Amino acid sequence: DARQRLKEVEVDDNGQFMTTDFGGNIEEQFSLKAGGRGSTLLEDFIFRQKLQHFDHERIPERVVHARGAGAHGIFTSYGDWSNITAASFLGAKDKQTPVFVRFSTVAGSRGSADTARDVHGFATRFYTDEGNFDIVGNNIPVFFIQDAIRFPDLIHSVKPSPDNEVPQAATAHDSAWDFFSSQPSALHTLFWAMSGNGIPRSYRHMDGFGIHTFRLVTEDGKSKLVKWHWKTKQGKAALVWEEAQVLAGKNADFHRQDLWDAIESGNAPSWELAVQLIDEDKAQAYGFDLLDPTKFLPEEFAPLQVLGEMTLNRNPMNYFAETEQISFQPGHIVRGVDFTEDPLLQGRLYSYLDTQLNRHRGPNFEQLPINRPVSGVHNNHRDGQGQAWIHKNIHHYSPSYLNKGYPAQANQTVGRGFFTTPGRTASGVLNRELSATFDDHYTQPRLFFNSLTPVEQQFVINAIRFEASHVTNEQVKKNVLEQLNKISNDVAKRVAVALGLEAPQPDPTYYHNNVTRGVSIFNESLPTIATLRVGVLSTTKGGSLDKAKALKEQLEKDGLKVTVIAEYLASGVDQTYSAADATAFDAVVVAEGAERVFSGKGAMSPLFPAGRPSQILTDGYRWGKPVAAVGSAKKALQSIGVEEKEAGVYAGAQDEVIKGVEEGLKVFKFLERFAVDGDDEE
Amino acid sequence: DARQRLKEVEVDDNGQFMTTDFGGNIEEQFSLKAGGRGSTLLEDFIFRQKLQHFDHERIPERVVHARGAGAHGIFTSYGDWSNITAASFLGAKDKQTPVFVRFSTVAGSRGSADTARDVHGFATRFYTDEGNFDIVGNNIPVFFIQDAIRFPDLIHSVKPSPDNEVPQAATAHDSAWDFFSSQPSALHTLFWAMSGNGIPRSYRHMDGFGIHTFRLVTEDGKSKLVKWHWKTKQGKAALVWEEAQVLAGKNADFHRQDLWDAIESGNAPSWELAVQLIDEDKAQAYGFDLLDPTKFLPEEFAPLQVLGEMTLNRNPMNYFAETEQISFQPGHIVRGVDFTEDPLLQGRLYSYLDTQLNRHRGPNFEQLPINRPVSGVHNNHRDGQGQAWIHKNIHHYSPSYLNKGYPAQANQTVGRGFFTTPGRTASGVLNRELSATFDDHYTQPRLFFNSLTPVEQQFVINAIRFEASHVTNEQVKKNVLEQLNKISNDVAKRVAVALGLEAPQPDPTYYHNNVTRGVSIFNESLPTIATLRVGVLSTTKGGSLDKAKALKEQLEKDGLKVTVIAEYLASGVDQTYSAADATAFDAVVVAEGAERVFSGKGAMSPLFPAGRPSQILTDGYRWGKPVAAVGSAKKALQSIGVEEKEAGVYAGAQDEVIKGVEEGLKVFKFLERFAVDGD
Amino acid sequence: DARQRLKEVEVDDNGQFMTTDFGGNIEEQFSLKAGGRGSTLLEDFIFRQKLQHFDHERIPERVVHARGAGAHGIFTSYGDWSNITAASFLGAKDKQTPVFVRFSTVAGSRGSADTARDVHGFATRFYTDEGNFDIVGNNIPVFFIQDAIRFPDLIHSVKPSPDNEVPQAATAHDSAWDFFSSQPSALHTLFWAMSGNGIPRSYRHMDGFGIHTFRLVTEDGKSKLVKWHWKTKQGKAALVWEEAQVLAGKNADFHRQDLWDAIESGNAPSWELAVQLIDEDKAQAYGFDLLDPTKFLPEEFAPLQVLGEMTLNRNPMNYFAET
Ligand code: HEM
Ligand code: HEM
Ligand code: HEM
Ligand SMILES: [O]
Ligand SMILES: [O]
Ligand SMILES: [O]
């Protein structure tokens, strides 16, 4: 149990009487009043201590990544990696370290939709025996900007306009695209956010990236440059934008429920921890500066080397005390790892320490149960708001004769202390510049786009088309066009069509045809269909429900989560048509006999909105999901104009439908149903 | 061990390596720099996590009673008091409850002197098995004001002037005496603060009071009116003002050191808890309203009934985490006790809960180790800054089928719940007024002044003369005299002399000659002299130090703390003359042969300020202490014009001096040395 | 008037009726009660709004230098110093700039005595036309330690023992002299603190120092190493320790009252701003490293150059809001 250390602070209220926060049993359902219908007394200490705690429940949301969810788990190392790092948690085969991971979006506030289009956070804490080590990552390997001092500008431009606070959780407005086109470094991450990475199917279907080049350091002090990767064992998978939008309204907790259900049902998700390793003397040897956070390292140049695997198997007990209160920091570093001169990472180190003082209203936030290490804290820090400990050492200073030198200094050779990479040097003038090696803002965006499938490329273009069409200012849109044209003339011309702007002329300085692996989502089927959702649309009339039950039981044998849907909650029905939507499922199957609710009287009922079963089937097909119908229910396929032998469409008896649906869930999205530019011309 | 429950939060750094606040061994004595003589790097996470915690160490001090100190201990009940209270901590003979007590001044800020003249706080927390019960009291049984809405007015007027923040920890300025005379209710507590209660010898030599009338409630709801009293087993003792002034500069920590040393040396101080009990129908029977916090109940009408004893025997381990962080509340009430309609108490219940939000910057301050009860907390409160627990009940609301009714409601008949006194009634118009029964502001100040000894009365008069002479405004000084003349014409006349104002003619409306017991300090000797301090003035020349060591060993047999003083720290010397002052001791005795440092070359040395041994003896004599000299050292007493004929002065051989000094310490202060108006 | 810009936030209550913090005239000398001898009602918004502000009056004292006092004034440049610095406030003869100065102790808390033996702060703000420039200095030209990461160790050692919080505003205890003897860099400032600098007669009778070497830079990038000096026009003066001990008890506000009285009586104190100017290539040429804050540069090697004069002529109107 990864939460084992947290059980000492867990409070069980069952079987007990109500109390105040300072003890004493009470009743707290009536205010103390001066007379039968009199005014409430100031001396009602019970009322005041109850309402004051309610009044003070909220803490500030995170300044970025305010919307997200998390879970506990275990990380297991696959070997003794002392040959590359002194990091304790990687020092032996099958060594296990408790983790907590929080996934998130970036721009939206606390109550915004999971399926907004956005970069996604992927923050992992290792509770190692030599301190907490945090990898505060994203599901995209490059970031918008090259210097941390520009972070407020980026975030202000993509967060709501400061006059009306419109729009929520979205880059589709003037200020954001004004910034993307005025700061061309941002276009690489923008392309990633405009792809499937911006609308993933779940937290469990994302890769993770530390983005920055870090350093692994051995006991003798030798170092190597390193990139952190998390590779999902569930496979990468993404939605389509028109589906993500409906899902934002139908279930804004789609992603956090996904992770919770997967863990509750015993299908804990896993990611493998992998690294790219680079010699120090090759930091600038691959066509870009490895200090540049707007660049990723093509796997053709440095392949991923798996070090271990992380499994998230325990949900939190109290979301606020654990998920909301946890405080990640890239400054949470340990012996065996070091920073680099990445100007974006450099400022992060200051920013995450500082912002905790705003979120937690004091300096003792590492004493919170979810932030505490398991390795012990011994120093001369004292006092501060909410000090939860009572220190014994009264000589709280160093050096000291009176405390005998304890707590004692630890460094590279004594006490396994942290040490900066010994060979690191500084050379040159103090400057407020960026290295000229950071100047190329277009080559890698072109590289990313080249490496996507044709329909995947169309998704990127259609996302940009959707986003840029919200920009009111004409010049901003033309500025966007000029910047896009430096990535690819074809992308600019296809985006320009939606904008009503003239197709720009080629500017080939950065054009190229190179491609790289690992970057696509839709060119690979899932390695497993466990936890994937199947909506079975049935009816309470006739014998349809009995068949849906058998259809459900066999589908569950393969590890799928099946929801039987009908007019009302008859025996065996999991959900009503009124409460059902196609966004909640990865495949839709119409049970035999349920074709009655797709036409005629059966489709017009007071118990669900008009056309709901037809709409669920239409949404699922148009959003590329595997859809099916058993036996006579093929008439439902007919009523929305879907043909039986289309790709990802399955009609027949129960068993062939079951096999066809499960095969289609591996494909996940059938991209034959999405038009590409040039298809419609006569 | 009263601190037993605090064991699990203690952190031991012995033999450990230095770490960050998130773990990981580090060194933290060098900043990370870019080159040999280079600038510090932002990426030095070690530096910023160490300095950030230092930068954020301070929390706001208490809005009042900022200066103070405390200790842990045990309360033991003397009996089963269920016939008067349902309170669990008083429900069985020999039942023990851990306590923590904080003593304080009122006006001064965190770093002000202990021996400022002020009302003194005396706050006790009982960690009962049915919740935390606080009696947030003072060492004076009455308060300045009758309605809690006036507390900011009182406190602003006493605290430093808002333009220059002058003066520190003192009532001796214009605005305070402008309030005292404009708000005549304040005259009673003023007289108490102008008495020995304003300059107590130590926290251990104070009585304590809850001030307010509260209610004790039995199981069936029948209530009694109650006054809380703490009776010190050490006896009450006070300084004189001219002595307390010097001590404020020589040792501003005089009182917190005295409490620490008493516990550290195994001389734990003790207080008996006593109550005055009054039937509900006698609330207005004794010449005043018991809802009025500017009056006390004379013990002739209701004797003190002792219910148990409290002993403070454990010092804190970290001052800030324990003493500074503890959050007292009169609203911390338990089953068997209830409030009364005292308009001062009523507002306190609001203001102590509210002020913790400022001092602790969050709603979860009761989760701090020093504030946690021992009895268990089960409710549906959640979240808040610094939430330190993880609740299991996901149905955090009532009523509810899903949580099966838990946590469940508790009331008078089920669950041992708190319950307001069943018979209390409201009646009349909603009003912003005070009862006319509150209108006498002069009788009880007169009663208090009557019940003190003549020199004790003179101390009060000389306190007033000192204080009011600091008031620059002439009309305020006349306003003060006009109000003092309402209490006693003789008091006003004697104060008027110092102010150069005319003796006002008698205003006899509230004059009376009644006296009451239990309010005097100087009319009673001390029950014990254990822990009292003796400074032995000696010299490294000759054989004086040998005799001082013998003198010390015999005095220590009586539980006295003895400091041998000489020019330098020779073998057997506890303190140099340079560091010594008479304010630190309760008796001064000159060892034989030490008269050499009282005149001539022995008095002129680079090792101490000129005349310092003579100043200590002069100070000790003039401040009413027992002073003595052994053998030839009587020349030192003659050198300052003091003769052995006098009370509190002892000479002769060693055993003669020891028995005399130990006798004199019981009297403590010799009031023969203080002149009285027209004596 | 140095305080001229603060007039528009000044609030006059003479002749007015009592109000709440959200307006509306009120009375606030009686709690609202349910009957003649009744309990106070929660609906008394007047009471709660008045006590909530009182309950929330205090803010944390400064982690160091908590005990001090201040005043407003004017700094006037003696010349056009553009040949050594581009600083606007030194860019013309007779140019005037508003200032505020806070003097302080170091160790003691908010209510500690002014005549404790201690290092003393001398913090000066110039409200220049190109931003606020602060010289946050002390009355002693050298500091205890050579690296800022050791500051919590120094301060923990000098401030009271964490078990009983004894002693107040004093280095005369075990932990302080443990650190002084274990960290020998501290002995320079120690010796200064043991001299008259530790018990000055008043704030007006102190010199001031920036301690650190800084840089003055011209418009074209030319730099010189600089040490800041404040030279009191009233003369340096100190007490004796047996006197300062009694004064700590007789008047804890001795220094803040002395500064207040001098300004209010028309006797405004003044200091001249003076600098030592060192070439960059001589940073290590005078028997020590000029980056080392435990060393001062003897004036025989570099005499002072007077840049201007500052005079403190305006007391604050509200201590809390200003000082
Ligand atoms: C490669 C670049 C970056 C990555 C991968 C990244 C990732 C993240 C993630 C995953 C979180 C949420 C952690 C959680 O779930 O609690 C977060 C929060 C945050 N980030 Fe970043 N971020 C990056 C850039 C930056 C920069 C450049 C800054 C500022 C200079 C910054 C400042 C913050 C702050 C202040 C928070 C809030 C943390 C808190 O309130 O606890 N981020 N970031
Ligand atoms: C009989 C009248 C009073 C007595 C005996 C009394 C006593 C005390 C004592 C002993 C303390 C110090 C607690 C400690 O040691 O931590 C204290 C603090 C305090 N008192 Fe009073 N007081 C009285 C009246 C009032 C009134 C009328 C108010 C406001 C309406 C008030 C507001 C406060 C506040 C806000 C604190 C600070 C509490 C904290 O920050 O923990 N007091 N009082
Ligand atoms: C040459 C060395 C130093 C000098 C001349 C100096 C001077 C001062 C002065 C005069 C003040 C009070 C200003 C006021 O009246 O508000 C002050 C406060 C302070 N000092 Fe220093 N100090 C020195 C060393 C340090 C170091 C090394 C640190 C930390 C690394 C530090 C941290 C602080 C802090 C946190 C405050 C509180 C300021 C506030 O609360 O606004 N000091 N110092
Ligand atoms: O971030
Ligand atoms: O108080
Ligand atoms: O400082």
Short mmCIF file of N, CA and C in Angstrom, two decimals, chain C residues 3-39:
data_model
loop_
_atom_site.label_atom_id
_atom_site.label_comp_id
_atom_site.label_asym_id
_atom_site.label_seq_id
_atom_site.Cartn_x
_atom_site.Cartn_y
_atom_site.Cartn_z
N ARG C 3 6.72 64.70 3.24
CA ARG C 3 5.54 63.84 3.28
C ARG C 3 4.45 64.29 2.31
N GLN C 4 4.76 65.20 1.38
CA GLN C 4 3.72 65.86 0.60
C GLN C 4 2.87 64.86 -0.17
N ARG C 5 3.48 63.81 -0.71
CA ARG C 5 2.75 62.83 -1.51
C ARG C 5 1.78 61.99 -0.68
N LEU C 6 1.97 61.91 0.63
CA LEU C 6 1.13 61.08 1.49
C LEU C 6 -0.13 61.79 1.96
N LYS C 7 -0.30 63.07 1.62
CA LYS C 7 -1.45 63.83 2.11
C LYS C 7 -2.76 63.24 1.61
N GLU C 8 -2.77 62.70 0.39
CA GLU C 8 -4.03 62.28 -0.22
C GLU C 8 -4.57 60.97 0.36
N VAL C 9 -3.82 60.28 1.21
CA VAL C 9 -4.34 59.12 1.93
C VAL C 9 -4.54 59.44 3.41
N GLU C 10 -4.40 60.70 3.80
CA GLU C 10 -4.61 61.10 5.18
C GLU C 10 -6.10 61.30 5.45
N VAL C 11 -6.55 60.83 6.61
CA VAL C 11 -7.96 60.76 6.96
C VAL C 11 -8.18 61.56 8.23
N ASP C 12 -9.09 62.53 8.18
CA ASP C 12 -9.40 63.41 9.30
C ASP C 12 -10.75 63.03 9.87
N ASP C 13 -10.79 62.75 11.17
CA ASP C 13 -12.02 62.36 11.85
C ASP C 13 -12.54 63.43 12.79
N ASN C 14 -11.91 64.61 12.82
CA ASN C 14 -12.40 65.70 13.65
C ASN C 14 -13.75 66.19 13.13
N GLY C 15 -14.70 66.36 14.04
CA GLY C 15 -16.01 66.87 13.69
C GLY C 15 -16.96 65.86 13.07
N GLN C 16 -16.53 64.62 12.87
CA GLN C 16 -17.33 63.63 12.16
C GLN C 16 -18.05 62.70 13.13
N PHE C 17 -19.05 62.00 12.61
CA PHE C 17 -19.74 60.95 13.34
C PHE C 17 -19.06 59.61 13.12
N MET C 18 -19.06 58.78 14.16
CA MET C 18 -18.60 57.39 14.07
C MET C 18 -19.30 56.67 12.93
N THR C 19 -18.53 55.87 12.18
CA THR C 19 -19.06 55.07 11.08
C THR C 19 -18.51 53.65 11.16
N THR C 20 -19.10 52.76 10.35
CA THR C 20 -18.50 51.46 10.09
C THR C 20 -17.39 51.61 9.05
N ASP C 21 -16.70 50.51 8.76
CA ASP C 21 -15.71 50.51 7.70
C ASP C 21 -16.33 50.52 6.31
N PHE C 22 -17.64 50.30 6.19
CA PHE C 22 -18.34 50.41 4.92
C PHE C 22 -19.32 51.58 4.90
N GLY C 23 -19.10 52.59 5.73
CA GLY C 23 -19.95 53.76 5.76
C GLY C 23 -21.18 53.57 6.64
N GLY C 24 -21.91 54.67 6.81
CA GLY C 24 -23.07 54.66 7.68
C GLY C 24 -22.72 55.03 9.10
N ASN C 25 -23.35 56.09 9.62
CA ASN C 25 -23.08 56.54 10.98
C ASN C 25 -23.62 55.55 12.00
N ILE C 26 -22.90 55.41 13.11
CA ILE C 26 -23.20 54.40 14.13
C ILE C 26 -22.88 54.95 15.51
N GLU C 27 -23.37 54.23 16.52
CA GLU C 27 -22.85 54.25 17.88
C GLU C 27 -22.22 52.89 18.14
N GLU C 28 -21.15 52.87 18.94
CA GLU C 28 -20.42 51.62 19.16
C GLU C 28 -19.86 51.55 20.57
N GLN C 29 -20.65 52.00 21.55
CA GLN C 29 -20.26 51.91 22.95
C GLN C 29 -21.11 50.92 23.74
N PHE C 30 -22.08 50.27 23.10
CA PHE C 30 -22.94 49.30 23.75
C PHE C 30 -23.17 48.13 22.81
N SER C 31 -23.02 46.92 23.33
CA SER C 31 -23.40 45.75 22.56
C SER C 31 -24.92 45.63 22.50
N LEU C 32 -25.42 45.09 21.39
CA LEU C 32 -26.84 44.80 21.26
C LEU C 32 -27.17 43.54 22.07
N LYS C 33 -28.15 43.65 22.96
CA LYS C 33 -28.46 42.58 23.90
C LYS C 33 -29.94 42.21 23.82
N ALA C 34 -30.24 40.97 24.18
CA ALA C 34 -31.62 40.47 24.21
C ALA C 34 -32.17 40.64 25.62
N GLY C 35 -32.64 41.85 25.91
CA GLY C 35 -33.17 42.19 27.21
C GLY C 35 -32.19 43.03 28.03
N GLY C 36 -32.70 43.53 29.15
CA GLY C 36 -31.93 44.48 29.95
C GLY C 36 -30.64 43.90 30.51
N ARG C 37 -30.68 42.65 30.94
CA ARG C 37 -29.51 41.93 31.42
C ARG C 37 -29.26 40.70 30.54
N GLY C 38 -29.35 40.88 29.23
CA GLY C 38 -29.38 39.77 28.31
C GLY C 38 -28.07 39.54 27.56
N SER C 39 -28.04 38.43 26.84
CA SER C 39 -26.88 38.04 26.06
C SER C 39 -26.73 38.92 24.82
#
